[PDB]
Design a protein around this ligand. Structure first.
Ligand SMILES: Nc1ncnc2c1ncn2[C@@H]1O[C@H](COP(=O)(O)OP(=O)(O)NP(=O)(O)O)[C@@H](O)[C@H]1O
Ligand SMILES: [Mg+2]
Ligand SMILES: [Mg+2]
Length: 1335
């Protein structure tokens, strides 16, 4: 009935249909019963409804109390849930018309609590659970928060057992007055508002009771309906989210404990079902982590180890009090020391023999259960009563100890578990046992652990793929007797020839695992030399996997990749390892690498010590076979895709340090508290006066840079009002005091005057630069081409000059951004000896100078030589004898003894007074003879004195550098020399976030220090990889040394790449820290003037940003108003219908293509080349890799060996063209059936902004027009014709302007075949009339 739902849409609510039939309630009733319910809530049906804008255009705007029904409530929830599943904005229509939302919300609550199997089915109530989960996860929306407040505030405690309430009020006496105040205010309520309030206050506690009864209805072994299982799963998901968010946890945690839900769940039949309850069990483990989480519910602070111990000791103590006073059977227990009774074992020993009635009575004295009336039997099971008391009082290991016992490698028990390692096929219909990233975290441990686990589990997916491919290729077959033979070979995996554990070291004190486990693994490189080289290319810290297969198939049996991998190859074990090094023929671990002989190679590796202990324990205790005698395959990976273990290790070490981040950052990082509290205007150490140096080009530029301020200059003469400028900021209060000042003379060589900034920064860019110079958090949102890089280097330059004792860390996502920063840095007044760039390569040098450790060591060495030669020349100019050359050491002696002495004597004469005596007594005439003469001008004392001063500064700089360079005389190796630059010499240190994550351990060990962090591409960087650069150093006197945090990025462009999008769908793992901070509400500086593309093209994406306009040169330069030759419009959206009955096609699954679009795009590219376009100035983009390869295929098969037709600079996907651009972009959107991942507006914005001068898009226009999120772009694109307007008699280039009517014929191409015809005829006319000649 796809034609049914669509016809309804067209009639009643579809977009781009002028007139619709009026609202009819029966449409909602019919669609819900016959389309949604009858199809068993089929996802495709729900998608069609959601995409057709059912919620926005029919459901909500026609919703009222008078028309509300079951079908109406459910339909709204289905649409909202689907929007979450599709990651599109879910709440906008409610925000638009909020009036009836409170009524709607209250009735969702009623429906959720409705009697099981009653009016609402269990599935329908699961849908409601999920919807409510989304609500609780969305308290940032005022409309939702105002409804949810009453469900989760202190008054909810009226759902507590009366004795437990009193216990809590006694525990926190200050709570009682607030409790009383609530009871008083309740009196002022009318009877219905009171009843509504009480129902809301009891909702969650009553919901728990409903769950418990559903859970109990699950049989132990008999068949169970999946609807019960899924209800229970979604319920625990709700519990976790409520518990993992402080505002929802604060009062509800006590409620959850009072209900004893967790004990019910662990004793339940459902968890005991190994297959059915597996997901439920994993969700349960997550909930347990949070119900026992180490945080104070009221203060929100993390609990110390002492506080934990006290809590545990107080519980035992109160149990012993009750034991002593009321239970003779527990006399011995009550008198015993805590340690002797508080283990699970001891507690079972003491309470296990007791009757059900006695245990119930014990629990009642702890306010855990109601009193058991005299002579009554308890209704609770003994195992419940026992587990209640035992679990509550047993010793717990801390969160840290729990973390420190986790293996860092996935085993075969994890890699194929799709509850925690979902495939890319994950629809989003079921839930996963995964952490979620949103806005807030409980504590730093919570924050770090969520990222740890998400990184861990996501990386495991890629490992699965690598294992399945390489091991399948090896074709493991059975041989005789019962052995394995490999029918194939693999590049990335080899048969193990030998394996031996060679070291099991003793545990550190306390820890129960070996500190180190090592093994030797031998392979036989009976392979192609290319493969032999790659295997010998393994290096220290490279991670490999050790695999055990016991093949199931006879020899020759075909493998099917579609079938379950484990049964296919007989997968038994997977263990990870880390290369220490390859052995040489002297038995030494290789760190002048040798040429080994033969084809056998042995590697010494590290095994995960926690995994080793667990396996050994399993072997010793349970007779399990020794896993480490069974490995027969070893697999290596691509190094660039294989950093997971090192990142996890870094994150775990962080969790084991005190994590000292700035106190003004901690709360914001965790996502709570005032988001603006780290803004410079609110920092207590805000600096009043700043030197802006070369930031402003003139006093006019400065005045224009502060629109809302009154500028007062300390000097009236307009000729003295030139840069550099100091600016003092107040604390009338809109007044800026500007002081012009003079750069100190640097010597008699005018070329040694400093380089200067040439960028006339806008007032907005100035706000960013100003903020970056101040202490605190500075966030800059920089739309495409708004000058992010110029802002960055100006901030860096200003910090460099203002605070010469501070060090700046630069972190980016890509090496391209680093290349751009260093390029612009080179044009500014920054000494290259203070620059350093870290990286793992073997990276192509793209800048004019080399800023790697290697390049910088070399510069220092070469500069030292030149400077020591200057000292020699100085020596001789002074008439000091001595033929020996200087070292940095003797140069230092020379400066103090020969230079400073002469200068001090000189200053004593002329600065303690004629113009003539400035020059007459100047001690360095001969040294500066080579400089432009005369040195002194003889005009005034002040002038010549400063000229003399500058000469001394020149000489002093020589010796300052040599003193810095002495280290290269004390450190011979390039590695030690590079260490000196990193720890001491450099003032600006740059690297990628990737490198920062890998190298944090080494950096901390080196004593790396820095004061300021600047980041670019911030919204492209994963959350945890944004956090790690905050901690590349040790704390200083107990506090973070970090003074500034500047982040520059664009959350309206593409996010960090998540290989497996299931982790985005469920967990929002792609969300950057930058993006989270913007969402949290951290104030941002939004750059508002782009300078790389036409204003006309900018309109296609500037709607997405705050006030994004264009820079003057874009508005005024001819190059932006000159039309594109042979094309009427500078941009067009071109409709492409079917070609030979096909639209989108899929030759391989998910390898989306569109022959009609591809052929049209290539034909246009050919058309342009035949017009004389620079083929290199054209790049071709598409949203799918399948189409990319197809366009390439057609490029080679249609252009081929054509002299008149070049190649486009690139043929690639939009996602691979981030930060890149060309003059002309040809874009293919491919899809005809469904919109696909272009619905992500960020992908849209990137796609709309890759072109400087020309953008031509080929798509099924109708499909994308219907997409609500894409409307602001496509409503602009459809304002122009959807048939390509060509002007084939106008060659490239043209002087025709953008607006003027063309002086040639305009022909309209109405489809691709007509175009492919035209281009063929045009070319056959050009082959006859011309002849070009490349060979
Ligand atoms: N205030 C300004 N006045 C004049 N030109 C500017 C100004 N700000 C930036 N530009 C220039 O405008 C051009 C576009 O900036 P650009 O470097 O490409 O943007 P970006 O934010 O740094 N990176 P991207 O978004 O990928 O293009 C550059 O040549 C800049 O130098
Ligand atoms: Mg809001
Ligand atoms: Mg850039």
């Amino acid at each position: 009935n796809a034609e049914f739902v669509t016809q309804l849409a067209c009639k009643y609510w579809a977009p781009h249909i002028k007139k619709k039939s009026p609202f009819d309630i029966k449409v909602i009733e019919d669609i819900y019963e016959k389309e949604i319910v009858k199809s068993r809530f089929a996802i495709r049906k729900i998608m069609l409804l959601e995409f057709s804008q059912y919620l926005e255009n029919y459901l909500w705007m026609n919703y009222s109390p008078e028309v509300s029904s079951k079908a109406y409530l459910m339909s709204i929830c289905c649409m909202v849930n689907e929007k979450f599943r599709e990651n599109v904005p879910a709440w906008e229509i409610f925000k638009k018309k909020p009036d009836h939302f409170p009524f709607f919300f209250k009735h969702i609550l009623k429906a959720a609590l409705a009697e099981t199997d009653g009016e609402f089915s269990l599935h329908e109530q699961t849908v409601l659970l999920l919807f409510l989960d989304h609500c609780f996860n969305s308290l940032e929306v005022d409309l939702i928060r105002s409804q949810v407040q009453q469900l989760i505030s202190l008054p909810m405690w009226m759902g507590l057992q009366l004795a437990r309430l009193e216990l809590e009020l006694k525990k926190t006496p200050k709570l009682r007055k607030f409790w009383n105040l609530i009871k008083k205010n309740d009196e002022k309520m009318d009877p219905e508002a009171r009843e509504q309030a009480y129902q809301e206050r009891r909702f969650l506690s009553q919901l728990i009771q409903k769950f418990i009864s559903v859970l109990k209805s699950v049989p132990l072994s008999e068949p169970v309906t999946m609807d019960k299982v899924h209800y229970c799963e979604r319920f625990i998901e709700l519990m976790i989210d409520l518990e993992a968010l402080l505002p929802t946890r604060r009062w509800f945690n006590t409620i959850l404990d009072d209900s004893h839900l967790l004990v019910h769940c662990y004793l339940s039949n459902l968890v005991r079902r190994e297959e059915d309850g597996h997901l439920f069990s994993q969700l349960l483990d997550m909930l347990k982590f949070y119900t026992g989480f180490e945080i104070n519910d009221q203060t929100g602070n993390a609990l110390t180890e002492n506080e934990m111990t006290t809590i545990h000791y107080d519980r035992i103590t109160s149990l012993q009090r009750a034991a002593f006073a009321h239970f003779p059977e527990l006399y011995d227990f009550a008198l015993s020391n805590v340690a002797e009774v508080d283990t699970r074992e001891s507690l079972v020993k003491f309470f296990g023999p007791l009757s059900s009635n006695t245990l119930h009575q014990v629990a009642s004295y702890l306010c855990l259960l109601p009193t058991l009336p005299k002579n009554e039997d308890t209704t609770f099971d003994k195992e419940f009563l026992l587990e209640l008391l035992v679990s509550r009082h047993e010793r717990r290991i801390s969160q840290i100890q729990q973390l420190n016992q986790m293996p860092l490698y996935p085993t075969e028990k994890i890699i194929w578990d799709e509850n925690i390692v979902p495939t890319e096929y994950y629809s989003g219909e079921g839930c996963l046992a995964l952490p979620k990233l949103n806005l807030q975290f409980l504590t730093l441990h919570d924050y770090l652990l969520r990222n740890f686990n998400l990184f861990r589990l996501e990386s495991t997916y890629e490992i699965r793929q690598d294992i399945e491919d390489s091991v399948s290729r090896m074709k493991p077959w059975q041989s005789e007797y019962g052995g394995v033979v490999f029918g194939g070979w693999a590049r990335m995996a080899q048969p193990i020839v030998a394996f031996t554990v060679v070291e099991v070291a003793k545990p550190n004190i306390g820890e129960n695992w070996p500190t180190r486990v090592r093994a030797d693994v031998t392979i036989n490189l009976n392979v192609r030399d290319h493969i032999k080289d790659e295997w010998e290319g393994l290096r220290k810290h490279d991670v490999c996997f050790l695999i055990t297969v016991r093949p199931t198939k006879p020899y020759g049996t075909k493998f099917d990749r579609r079938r379950p991998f484990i049964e296919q190859v007989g997968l038994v074990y997977v263990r990870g390892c880390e290369i220490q090094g390859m052995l040489d023929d002297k038995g030494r671990v290789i760190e002048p690498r040798p040429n080994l002989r033969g084809e056998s190679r042995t590697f010494r590796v590290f095994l995960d010590p926690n995994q080793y202990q667990q396996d050994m324990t399993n072997t010793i205790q349970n007779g399990a076979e020794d896993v480490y005698e069974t490995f027969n395959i070893i697999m290596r990976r691509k190094p660039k895709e294989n950093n997971f273990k090192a990142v996890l290790e870094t994150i775990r070490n962080l969790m084991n340090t005190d994590c000292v981040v700035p106190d003004w950052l901690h709360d914001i990082i965790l996502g709570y508290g005032d988001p603006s509290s780290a803004h410079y205007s609110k920092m207590p150490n805000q600096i009043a006066t700043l030197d802006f140096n070369d930031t402003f080009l003139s006093i006019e530029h400065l005045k224009a840079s502060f629109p809302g301020h009154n500028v007062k200059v300390t000097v009236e003469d307009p000729a003295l009002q030139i840069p550099p400028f100091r600016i003092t900021f107040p604390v009338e209060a809109k007044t800026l005091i500007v002081e012009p000042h003079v750069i100190p003379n640097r010597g008699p060589y005018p070329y040694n005057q400093p380089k200067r900034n040439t960028i006339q920064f806008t007032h907005t860019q100035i706000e960013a630069i100003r903020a970056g110079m101040q202490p605190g958090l500075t966030m800059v949102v920089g739309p495409p081409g708004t000058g992010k890089t110029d802002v960055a280097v100006q901030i860096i330059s200003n910090i460099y000059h203002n605070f010469p004792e501070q060090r700046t860390l630069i972190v980016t996502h890509s090496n391209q951004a680093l290349n751009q920063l260093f390029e612009k840095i080179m044009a500014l007044d920054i000494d290259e000896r203070h620059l350093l760039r870290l990286g793992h390569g073997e990276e192509e040098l793209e800048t004019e100078k080399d800023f790697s450790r290697y390049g910088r060591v070399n510069y220092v060495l070469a500069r030292r030589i030149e400077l020591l030669e200057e000292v020699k020349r100085l020596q001789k100019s002074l008439g000091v004898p001595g033929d020996a050359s200087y070292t940095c050491e003797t140069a230092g002696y020379f400066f103090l003894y020969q230079v400073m002495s002469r200068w001090e004597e000189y200053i004593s004469k002329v600065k303690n007074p004629d113009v003539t005596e400035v020059s007459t007594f100047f001690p360095f005439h001969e040294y500066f003879a080579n400089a432009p003469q005369p040195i002194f001008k003889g005009r005034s004392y002040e002038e010549d004195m400063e000229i003399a001063e500058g000469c001394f500064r020149h000489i002093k700089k020589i010796f300052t550098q040599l003193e810095e360079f002495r280290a290269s005389e004390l450190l011979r190796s390039g590695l030690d020399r590079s260490k000196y630059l990193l720890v001491k010499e450099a003032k600006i240190i740059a690297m990628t976030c990737t490198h920062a994550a890998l190298k944090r351990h080494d950096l901390v060990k080196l004593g790396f220090k820095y004061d300021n962090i600047l980041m670019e591409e911030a919204a492209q960087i994963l959350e945890i990889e944004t956090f790690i650069p905050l901690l590349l150093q040790n704390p200083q006197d107990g506090f973070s040394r970090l003074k500034r945090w500047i982040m520059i990025g664009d959350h309206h462009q593409l996010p960090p790449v998540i290989k497996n999008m299931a982790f985005q769908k469920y967990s929002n793992m792609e969300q950057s820290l930058f993006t989270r901070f913007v969402r949290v509400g951290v104030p941002t500086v939004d750059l508002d003037a782009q300078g790389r593309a036409r204003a006309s093209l900018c309109n296609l994406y500037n709607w997405r940003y705050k006030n994004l306009g264009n820079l003057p040169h874009v508005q005024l330069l001819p190059e932006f108003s000159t039309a594109n030759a042979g094309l009427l419009y500078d941009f067009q959206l071109i409709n492409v219908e079917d070609f030979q009955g096909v639209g989108e096609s899929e030759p391989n699954p998910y390898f989306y293509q569109n022959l009609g679009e591809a052929e049209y795009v290539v034909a246009l590219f050919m058309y342009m080349c035949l017009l004389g376009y620079p083929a290199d100035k054209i790049s071709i983009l598409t949203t799918y890799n399948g189409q990319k390869h197809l366009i390439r295929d057609i490029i080679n098969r249609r252009c081929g060996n054509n002299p008149l037709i070049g190649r486009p600079n690139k043929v690639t996907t939009v996602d691979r063209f981030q930060g890149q651009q060309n003059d002309y972009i040809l874009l293919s959107l491919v899809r005809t059936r469904a919109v696909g991942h272009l619905r992500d507006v960020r992908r849209l914005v990137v796609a709309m902004s890759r072109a400087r001068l020309g953008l031509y898009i080929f798509a099924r226009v109708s499909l994308f027009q219907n997409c609500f999120e894409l409307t602001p772009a496509f409503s602009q694109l459809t304002a122009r014709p959807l048939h390509l307007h060509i002007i084939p008699t106008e060659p490239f280039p043209t002087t025709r302007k953008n607006g003027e009517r063309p002086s040639h014929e305009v022909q309209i191409i109405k489809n691709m075949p007509q175009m492919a015809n035209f281009v063929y005829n045009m070319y056959m006319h050009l082959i006859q009339t011309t002849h070009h000649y490349h060979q």
